[PDB]
């Protein structure tokens with residue numbers, strides 16, 4: 001019954017190693033991150 | 049049983065797995081480990097165990113030669129069915145390490161075995177069906193590499209009726225394991241693996257391809273897959289040529305045999321040992337560095353040792369030395385930055401070994417990144433956002449300028465570049481930071497690097513009758529950011545021709561089949577100096593420097609040449625800084641100031657037309 | 672004098688390779704004798720190692736002591752003969768101990 005339920009906010013992010021130190025001839029690695037509730041809409045892409 | 053294993057009961061796999069023979073071979077392996085020794089009488093394996101324990105390592109390297117000479121039968125059985133005796137010898141090594149070091153299980157519950165010195169060598173194209181499920185030693189080139197993934201080792205299961213956590217169950221690395229009975233519920237219902245209470249290990253997949261050198265004419269290089277586990281991950285990177293000893297086996301899982309068509313099976317290699325077919329230093333060579341630095345004439349000593357395979361061009365070599373050492377950056381109150389990298393431009397006629405200089409710099413420098421304005425290059429010059437060929441994920445990749453931060457960027461054929469790349473270099477040289485606004489990403493990246501470039505004049509031949517500005521397609525904004533402009537003219541001279549010709553022909557005849565510091569020490573010298581030296585200035589040279597600058601300004605304005613501007617003074621100071629650095633000293637000397645004055649003044653004068661150049665030669669004949 | 676030799680310069684160890692296919696009971700019996708000899712030599716203070724190397728001075732062995740020349744060069748006893756290191760049988764070791772008069776029979780909360 002959706003009229004009497006409560007929900008929250010969930011979000012995904014991708015984190016990449018700093019491009020300066022990548023080894024030559026390689027593509028940089030990255031990881032997936034999950035955050036929720038009050039840790040959503042805190043950063044924007046490009047931030048360190 | 050005692051060395052009666054020569055009698056065979058059935059196929060080798062069936063024979064080896066019998067318990068009594070298992071104990072027999074276990075004890076025999078124990079005797080090998082605890083009694084082997086070479087002629088010298090030193091405990092090879094005892095010392096190996098000692099170093100392993102003290103270092104807190106996890107694997108024993110073993111020599112197939114020793115094993116075969118001692119207990120040949122074991123070596124043959126190993127070549128035939130390596131799968132089982134790897135486990136047997138693992139337990140042997142575990143108990144031996146427990147005997148030496150107590151409670152090693154507290155830190156490591158397993159010690160692996162890495163075989164070595166396998167006698168037979170194979171190429172990836174020689175494998176056939178008779179080599180399946182055996183020990184092989186191949187050699188190839190790494191072509192692609194995946195990330196590191198966790199793989200189950202000790203799995204635990206949750207019962208969903210009673211919340212019981214079932215105990216450890218080993219994962220054999222052959223198929224996934226399952227359970228069907230709950231000790232407390234006496235049930236068989238659902239189960240789920242417990243992520244938090246599981247112990248994993250490392251997993252990686254690599255692609256090997258035959259080395260292009262060895263393939264016979266008219267055929268293609270084959271390739272294979274390789275599996276690395278535990279501590280073998282991230283040991284080799286793409287482009288390195290390696291030898292791998294491992295177990296050759298099918299992908300028995302495949303997908304399924306309901307597939308239509310012929311029943312063909314794929315194959316892989318499970319790696320056991322991997323081996324490739326530096327700038328760190330120590331006190332022993334640090335005292336050596338200091339001893340060499342204390343010597344006089346160290347500047348010429350270093351300069352003479354650059355690009356040994358090229359004759360002459362001392363100005364080129366000294367410029368390369370100065371830009372390869374580099375100065376010291378500065379920042380006044382964090383509001384006025386001064387760069388510390390020296391920029392050199394080469395401008396020469398065809399057939400001058402400019403590309404050879406660039407290749408030598410690439411091989412010698414710590415962090416050198418190559419690129420070109422035309423041709424095939426592993427990387428471009430502009431930052432971008434690209435899809436990943438394998439992981440199918442967006443990635444942000446900077447150009448060679450970004451990737452070579454705190455390093456050197458080499459550009460070949462500088463004059464044939466396009467609009468985007470020229471803009472990128474202009475930005476990097478002017479600001480040392482590359483902006484980017486793409487795919488929702490807005491940011492800036494550091495690009496502090498030293499640039500070395502090569503080019504050719506308009507028409508392929510230098511016109512000494514005109515100023516340098518009109519001999520190239522480059523524009524003044526990009527030409528003024530350099531500080532060492534080298535111009536090479538292919539003027540014809542007899543003696544030079546004989547010297548160069550004898551050089552080249554003698555090199556060729558040596559290369560037919562049938563003073564300078566050693567390079568290995570030199571690279572460490574560069575690294576240590578750059579890491580540990582930061583020369584300073586003395587306020588007693590201001591009079592000399594100011595008088596020189598005033599004199600140059602006056603003469604230049606009198607002769608109506610390219611203006612002399614404080615950029616030249618800054619370059620002089622930077623070059624003197626680099627010169628002082630190369631001596632390992634902490635202060636700048638009048639000798640270094642003299643050398644920097646020489647270099648800068650010569651570079652400026654050499655780039656003028658004939659009349660102006662001749663006029664200035666007399667004026668600045670003091671140097 | 673023998674005790675001085677022992678507690679100063681006697682590095683010892685025991686061969687773990689046997690020349691007879693004994694049953695588990697007899698193997699355990701000789702192992703118990705081995706342990707008794709270990710404790711006996713410990714009482715006299717000679718070092719007992721865990722691996723053969725040229726430094727060792729006595730090896731104590733069950734196998735034959737008259738047929739070393741027939742063994743392999745890689746063989747431990749062959750190495751001992753080459754290095755002039757002293758080889759004892761278990762009976763010889765027991766005799767030596769008896770002659771030196773080493774008696775073998777004898778938080779929560």
Ligand SMILES: Nc1ncnc2c1ncn2[C@@H]1O[C@H](COP(=O)(O)OP(=O)(O)OP(=O)(O)O)[C@@H](O)[C@H]1O
Pocket residue numbers: 357358359396397398399400401402403404504548552
């Ligand atoms: N002074 C020299 N001494 C020895 N070999 C030289 C010299 N100058 C050129 N060479 C050789 O001649 C050939 C010239 O090609 P290279 O690419 O090295 O020259 P470059 O000056 O970069 O010219 P470009 O790129 O315009 O062809 C190469 O084999 C180079 O090794």
Ligand SMILES: [Mg+2]
Pocket residue numbers: 402403404
């Ligand atoms: Mg070239």
Ligand SMILES: [Zn+2]
Pocket residue numbers: 207208209210211212230231232233234235
């Ligand atoms: Zn249950």
